[PDB]
C-alpha cells in the first residue's frame, strides 16, 4: 500500500486507526525495527520501550507499556498497545523512583509476585530512561 | 525478567507493566479512567462441581 | 600360551567375579554389583529397541552385549605404565571388525540375496546416478568396517605410548632440578589427566563400537 | 538364580558362526603364506 | 599371525557368556519382574 | 630409491591433511542434530539415522585420504 | 625417474586434499537438511531427494580429486 | 627434463586443491536452498532453476581448476 | 632452462588455488540470495540483478588470478 | 640467474592466495546486502552506497596483492 | 638413511597437522550441546550422550591422524 | 647473495597473504554495518565512525604485512 | 646428522600449530557458554562443569600437539 | 650465512601470517559491537570499552607476531 | 650446522603460526561477550570474568606456540 498505516490503539481510547506514518520505531524483544512502507509480514512481541511515531509533522515519541508489533503483507502495521506516553507530560520522576524503591522490598516476596515485582522495577527503569 | 516460569504468564507480565505505567503516571494524567483500571474487586470462587472451591479468591 | 591368550584368560577370571560370584540374595537387589551390570544391561537393552527394534531386536541382543563386554573389560585394566595391553599389536581388533562385517553380509545375502544389492540405492539416484552411488555405498561398506577396527586399537596403542613418553620426561625432570618445586608435579599432573582420558575414551569407544555394530545390523536385517 | 530357561544360543546365531568358520579356513593359510620366520 | 586359540576361542567365549547371561540372569531379571508382578496381584 | 621413499613419506603426510575436513564435517552434522532435537525433540527418532549416514560419508572421505596415505606408505 | 616418481607421489598426496572440501560440503548440506526438517517436518519428503543428490556430487568432486591423485600415482 | 616433469606433477597436485572451494560453495548453495524450501515450500519451484544455475557456475569454477591441472599434466 | 619452466609450473599451480575462494564466495552470495528470496518472494525482481552483478564481479576477481596463472604458464 | 627468477616466479604464485580473502569479502558484503534488502526492501537507498564502498575497500587488498605479484614478475 | 629419516619426520609433522580439525570439531559439537540445553533445559538427558558420542568420533578421528604420524616416528 | 635474493623474493611472496585477512575482516565489519542498519536505520550515524575506526584497525594488519614484505624486498 | 636435526626442528615447529585448534576450540566452547548463560541464566550451573570438561579436552589435544613437538625436538 | 639468511627471510615471511588472526580479531569484535549497538543503543556505552580492550589485545598478539618476524630480519 | 640453524629459524617461524588461534579465539570470545551483554545488561557481571578467563587460556595456547618458537630461536 501507499506508505504505512498504523493501528496504534489503547483500551481507554485508540491512538491511531491507520494514520499514514513516515516511520515507526518498535522496541521489541530482539530489537527495534523500522517499518515505513511495504516491508514483509511479521509477528513480534513489543518490549516496553519508546515506540516513536516519526511523521512529517514531527517525530513524536511514545513509551509503550507492552504489546505486539505485527505486520501484514498489504503494508499493514497492527500495533496493539495498552498505555502510552503522551508527549512528555507522562514524565514523573519522583513517584517512579518511589515505587521502585518501595516495592523492590517485595521483589523477593513470593515466586510469581517477586518476578512481577522485578519486572515492574525493570519497566520503571525503562520509564526512567524515557524520563531523560 | 522471567515471567513464564518465575512469573505466571504473559498476561500477568503485561498487566503488571500496565499497572506500572498507570500508577507511575504523572499527577495531571491521573483521572477516573486510571482509577477504574486500578480498581479491581473480583472474587474467584471456582465452583466445586466435583471439588476445589476457591471461595471468592480476591483479584 | 601367547600374551594374547593369557590376557584372554585374565579377562574371563574378572568377568565371572562380578555377578556370577555373588548369587546369594535371591533378589533383584542386595548387592551393588548387581545394580552395576543391569544398569549397563538396561542401557544396551533399550538401545537395542531404539536401534534394532521392530521384529528381532532381542534375538540379536547378546552379540552386541558380549562384544560390548569384551571391549569394556579389555579397556578397564589398560592404564598401568607396564600394561603390555593386548600385546601392543591390537591386530585382533581389526580381525573382530572384519569378521563382524563378513558375518553381516552373509546374513544380508542369506536374507535378501540379490535384493541386498538394492540397498545401494535407498530412495532416488536414477540410472545416471546409479553407478556413482553404488560405488560410494559399496566402498563405504568396506570403509567403515576397517576403520572401526583400526581406530580403537591405534588409540589404545597411542594412549599406552603417551603413558611412557611423558613418563620418561618426568624421570628427566625429577633428576635434573635441585631445589625448585614446579618441575615434576605438573608433568605428573598431565600424567593424571592423560590417564583419565585414556580410561574415559575406552568406555565410550566401547559404547561407540556397540552402537556402530548395532547400526550395521539394521542395514543387514532391514533394507532402506 | 541360575535356573536355565532356554533361550536362542545357536538357532539364530548360525550366520556369524559359519562366517567365522569360512574365515578360519584361509585365516591359517594367510599366516602360512606370509610365514617370514 | 597367531590366531588359533583366540578367535575360535573368542566365539567360544561369546557362547559361554551367552549361556551364563541368557540362561542365568535374563531369567533372573525376568523372574524378579514376574515375581513382584504376582506379588501385587 | 631413498628420495622415492622420502617423497612417499611426505606424500602420505600431506595426504593426511584432508581428514580435518572430515572431522569438522561429522562435528557440524552432530551439532545440527543437537540443534534440531532442541527445536523438535519429537522428530529425533526420524532424524537420527541421517546423522550416522553423513558421519559415514565424511569418514569415507577421511579414509580415502587414509587410502592415499597408506598406498603412499606401503 | 627418481625425482619424477617422487613428485608424482607428492602431487598425489596434495591432490587427495579434495576430500576435505567434499566432507565439509556434504556436512553443511546435511546440517541445513536437519535444521529444515526439524523446523519443518512436513518438508522432509520433498527436501530429501535434491539434498541426497547434492551431497552425492559434492562427494563426487572429492572423488575427482582422488582420481587425480590416482593418475598421479599411476 | 625430469625436473620439469616433477614440477609439473607438483603443480597439478597443488592445482587439485582448487576443487575444495567449488565443493564448499555448491554445498552451501544447496544448504540455503534446503533452508529456504523448508521455510516456505512455495518458493522451491521459482528457485530451483536459478539454484541449479548457481550450482553449475560453482561447478564450472571447479572444472576450470581441474582443467588447468589437466593442461599442466598434459 | 629447466628450473625456470619448473618454477613457472609451480607458481601457476599455487596460483590456481585462488579460484577456490572466488567460487565459494560466488556461492555464498548465491546462498544469501536464496535466503532472501525465500524470506521475501516479492523481492526477487530487486535482488536478482544485484546478485548477478556480485556473481560476475567475484567471477572476474577469480578470473584475473586465473589469467595470472595463465601468463605464468605461457608467458 | 635462473634460481632468483625461479624463486620470484614461486613468490608471485604464492602472492595470489589473497584472492580467497578478497573474493570472500566481496561475497559476504554482497550477501549481507542482499539479505538486508530482502528483509528490509526500504533500506536499499542507504545500504547500496556503503555496500559498494566496502566492496572497494575489500578489493583494495586483492588488487594490491596482484600489483605486488606483478612487480615481482616484472 | 639421512634424507629418508628427514622426510619421515616432515611427514609425521604434516600428519600431526590433522588434530586441528578434531579439536575444532569436538568443541563445536559441545557448543551445540550448550546451546541446545540452554534453550531447552529438558533435553539435556537426550542430547548429552549424543554429543559425547560425536566427541568420541572426532577424537578418534584426530587419533587416527596421530597414528599416521606415529607410524613415521617408530 | 644470489640465493639470499631468491629467498627474499619467496619470503615476500609468502608474507603477502595478510591482505587476505585484512580484506575479509573489513568486509565482515561492513556486513555487520549493513545488517545493523537494515535492522535499525537510526543507528547508522552512531555506527559510522566506530566502524571506520574498526576498518582502519583491521587494515593495519595488511599495512604491517606490506611493510614486512617491503623489508624483505628492499 | 645435521639434516636429521634440522628436519626434527622444522617438524616440531609445524606440529606446534595444534595449539591454534586448542585455543579456537576452547574459545568456541566459552562463546557457547556465554550465549547460554546470557539467554538462560538458570542453565548456567548445569552447563558450566560441562564447559570446563570441553575446555579440558580441547586444551589436552593442544598440549598433546605440544608434546609431539617436544618429542620431535628432543628425540 | 647464505642458507641462514635465506631461512631467516622465509621465516619472517611465514611469521607474517599472525596478522591474519589479529585482523580477524579486531574485525569480528567490531562486527559484534555493531550488531549489539544496532540492536540496543543504551548498551553501546558499556559495550564500547570492552570491544576496545578486545581489539587492543588482538593487536597486541599481532604485534607479538610482528616482533618475532622482525627479529628474524634484524 | 648451517642447515641446522636455518631449519631452526624456519621451525620457529612456522611455529609462530599458532597465534592465529589466539587472535581469532579472543575474537570470537569477545564477539560472544558483546552479544551476551547486549542481550541483557544483568548477565554482564556473571559473564565477563569467565570470558576474560577464556581469553587468558586462548592466549596461553598462543604463548605456548610463542615459547616453542623461542626455543627454536635461542
Curated annotation (Swiss-Prot), chain A:
One of its GO terms (cellular component) is mitochondrial inner membrane. It is found in: Mitochondrion; Mitochondrion inner membrane. Keywords: ATP synthesis, CF(1), Hydrogen ion transport, Ion transport, Membrane, Mitochondrion, Mitochondrion inner membrane, Transit peptide, Transport. The keyword Membrane applies. One of its GO terms (molecular function) is proton-transporting ATP synthase activity, rotational mechanism. One of its GO terms (biological process) is proton motive force-driven ATP synthesis. It comes from the Eukaryota. Mitochondrial membrane ATP synthase (F(1)F(0) ATP synthase or Complex V) produces ATP from ADP in the presence of a proton gradient across the membrane which is generated by electron transport complexes of the respiratory chain. F-type ATPases consist of two structural domains, F(1) - containing the extramembraneous catalytic core, and F(0) - containing the membrane proton channel, linked together by a central stalk and a peripheral stalk. During catalysis, ATP turnover in the catalytic domain of F(1) is coupled via a rotary mechanism of the central stalk subunits to proton translocation. Belongs to the ATPase epsilon chain family. F-type ATPases have 2 components, CF(1) - the catalytic core - and CF(0) - the membrane proton channel. CF(1) has five subunits: alpha(3), beta(3), gamma(1), delta(1), epsilon(1). CF(0) has three main subunits: a, b and c. This is ATP synthase subunit delta, mitochondrial.
From Swiss-Prot, chain B:
One of its GO terms (cellular component) is mitochondrial inner membrane. Present with 4280 molecules/cell in log phase SD medium. The modification Phosphothreonine is found at residue 51. Pfam families: ATP-synt_Eps. This is ATP synthase subunit epsilon, mitochondrial. Mitochondrial membrane ATP synthase (F(1)F(0) ATP synthase or Complex V) produces ATP from ADP in the presence of a proton gradient across the membrane which is generated by electron transport complexes of the respiratory chain. F-type ATPases consist of two structural domains, F(1) - containing the extramembraneous catalytic core, and F(0) - containing the membrane proton channel, linked together by a central stalk and a peripheral stalk. During catalysis, ATP synthesis in the catalytic domain of F(1) is coupled via a rotary mechanism of the central stalk subunits to proton translocation. GO terms for molecular function: proton-transporting ATP synthase activity, rotational mechanism. One of its GO terms (biological process) is proton motive force-driven ATP synthesis. It is found in: Mitochondrion; Mitochondrion inner membrane.
Curated annotation (Swiss-Prot), chain C:
Keywords: ATP synthesis, CF(0), Hydrogen ion transport, Ion transport, Membrane, Mitochondrion, Mitochondrion inner membrane, Transmembrane, Transmembrane helix, Transport. InterPro entries: ATP_synth_F0_asu (IPR000568), ATP_synth_F0_asu_AS (IPR023011), ATP_synth_F0_asu_bact/mt (IPR045083), F0_ATP_A_sf (IPR035908). Its main location: mitochondrion. Changing residue 210 to T: In strain: D273-10B/A1. It is a multi-pass membrane protein. The chain crosses the membrane at residues 1-21, 57-77, 90-110, 115-135, 156-176, 181-201. Changing residue 206 to S: In strain: D273-10B/A1. It comes from the Eukaryota. GO terms for cellular component: mitochondrial inner membrane; mitochondrion; proton-transporting ATP synthase complex. The keyword Translocase does not apply. It is found in: Mitochondrion inner membrane. PANTHER family: ATP SYNTHASE SUBUNIT A (PTHR11410:SF0). Mitochondrial membrane ATP synthase (F(1)F(0) ATP synthase or Complex V) produces ATP from ADP in the presence of a proton gradient across the membrane which is generated by electron transport complexes of the respiratory chain. F-type ATPases consist of two structural domains, F(1) - containing the extramembraneous catalytic core and F(0) - containing the membrane proton channel, linked together by a central stalk and a peripheral stalk. During catalysis, ATP synthesis in the catalytic domain of F(1) is coupled via a rotary mechanism of the central stalk subunits to proton translocation. Belongs to the ATPase A chain family. F-type ATPases have 2 components, CF(1) - the catalytic core - and CF(0) - the membrane proton channel. In yeast, the dimeric form of ATP synthase consists of 17 polypeptides: alpha, beta, gamma, delta, epsilon, 4 (B), 5 (OSCP), 6 (A), 8, 9 (C), d, E (Tim11), f, g, h, i/j and k. This is ATP synthase subunit a.
Amino acid at each position: 500500500s501507499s506508505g504505512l498505516k498504523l493501528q496504534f490503539a489503547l483500551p481507554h481510547e485508540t491512538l491511531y486507526s491507520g494514520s499514514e506514518v513516515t516511520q515507526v520505531n518498535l522496541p521489541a524483544k530482539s530489537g527495534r525495527i523500522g517499518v515505513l512502507a511495504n516491508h514483509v509480514p511479521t509477528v513480534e512481541q513489543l518490549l516496553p520501550g519508546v515506540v516513536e511515531v516519526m511523521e512529517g509533522s514531527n517525530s513524536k515519541k511514545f513509551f509503550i507499556s507492552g504489546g505486539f508489533a505485527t505486520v501484514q503483507p498489504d503494508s499493514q502495521l497492527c500495533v496493539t498497545a495498552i498505555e502510552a506516553f503522551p508527549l512528555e507530560s507522562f514524565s514523573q520522576e519522583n513517584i517512579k523512583n518511589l515505587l521502585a524503591e518501595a516495592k523492590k522490598n517485595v521483589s523477593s516476596s513470593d515466586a510469581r509476585e517477586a518476578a512481577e515485582a522485578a519486572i515492574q522495577v525493570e519497566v520503571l527503569e525503562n520509564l526512567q530512561s524515557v524520563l531523560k | 525478567s522471567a515471567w513464564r516460569k518465575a512469573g505466571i504468564s504473559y498476561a500477568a507480565y503485561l498487566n503488571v507493566a500496565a499497572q506500572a505505567i498507570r500508577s507511575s503516571l504523572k499527577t495531571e494524567l491521573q483521572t477516573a479512567s486510571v482509577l477504574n483500571r486500578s480498581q479491581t474487586d473480583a472474587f474467584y470462587t471456582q465452583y466445586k462441581n466435583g471439588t476445589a472451591a476457591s471461595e471468592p479468591t480476591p483479584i | 600360551l601367547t600374551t594374547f591368550s593369557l590376557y584372554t584368560i585374565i579377562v574371563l577370571l574378572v568377568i565371572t567375579s562380578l555377578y556370577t560370584l555373588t548369587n546369594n540374595n535371591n533378589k533383584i537387589i542386595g548387592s551393588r554389583w548387581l545394580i552395576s551390570q543391569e544398569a549397563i544391561y538396561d542401557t544396551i537393552m533399550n538401545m537395542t529397541k531404539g536401534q534394532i527394534g521392530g521384529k528381532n531386536w532381542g534375538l540379536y541382543f547378546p552379540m552386541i552385549f558380549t562384544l560390548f563386554m569384551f571391549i569394556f573389560i579389555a579397556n578397564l585394566i589398560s592404564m598401568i605404565p607396564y600394561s603390555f595391553a593386548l600385546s601392543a599389536h591390537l591386530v585382533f581388533i581389526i580381525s573382530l571388525s572384519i569378521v563382524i562385517w563378513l558375518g553381516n553380509t552373509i546374513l544380508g545375502l542369506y536374507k535378501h540375496g540379490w535384493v541386498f544389492f538394492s540397498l545401494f540405492v535407498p530412495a532416488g539416484t536414477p540410472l545416471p546416478l546409479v553407478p556413482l552411488l553404488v560405488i560410494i555405498e559399496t566402498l563405504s561398506y568396506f570403509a567403515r568396517a576397517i576403520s572401526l577396527g583400526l581406530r580403537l586399537g591405534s588409540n589404545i596403542l597411542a594412549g599406552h605410548l603417551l603413558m611412557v613418553i611423558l613418563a620418561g620426561l618426568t624421570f628427566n625432570f625429577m633428576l635434573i632440578n635441585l631445589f625448585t618445586l614446579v618441575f615434576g608435579f605438573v608433568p605428573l599432573a598431565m600424567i593424571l589427566a592423560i590417564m583419565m582420558l585414556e580410561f574415559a575414551i575406552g568406555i565410550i569407544q566401547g559404547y561407540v563400537w556397540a552402537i556402530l555394530t548395532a547400526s550395521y545390523l539394521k542395514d543387514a536385517v532391514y533394507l532402506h | 538364580m541360575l535356573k536355565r530357561f532356554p533361550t536362542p544360543i545357536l538357532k539364530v546365531y548360525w550366520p556369524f558362526f559359519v562366517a567365522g568358520a569360512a574365515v578360519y579356513y584361509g585365516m591359517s593359510k594367510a599366516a602360512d603364506l606370509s610365514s617370514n620366520t | 599371525f597367531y590366531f588359533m586359540n583366540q578367535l575360535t576361542y573368542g566365539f567360544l567365549l561369546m557362547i559361554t557368556l551367552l549361556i551364563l547371561f541368557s540362561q542365568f540372569f535374563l531369567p533372573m531379571i525376568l523372574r524378579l519382574y514376574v515375581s513382584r508382578l504376582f506379588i501385587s496381584k | 630409491m631413498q628420495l622415492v621413499l622420502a617423497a612417499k613419506y611426505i606424500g602420505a603426510g600431506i595426504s593426511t591433511i584432508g581428514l580435518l575436513g572430515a572431522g569438522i564435517g561429522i562435528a557440524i552434522v552432530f551439532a545440527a542434530l543437537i540443534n534440531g532435537v532442541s527445536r523438535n525433540p519429537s522428530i529425533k527418532d526420524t532424524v537420527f539415522p541421517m546423522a550416522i549416514l553423513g558421519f559415514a560419508l565424511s569418514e569415507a572421505t577421511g579414509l580415502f585420504c587414509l587410502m592415499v596415505s597408506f598406498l603412499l606408505l606401503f
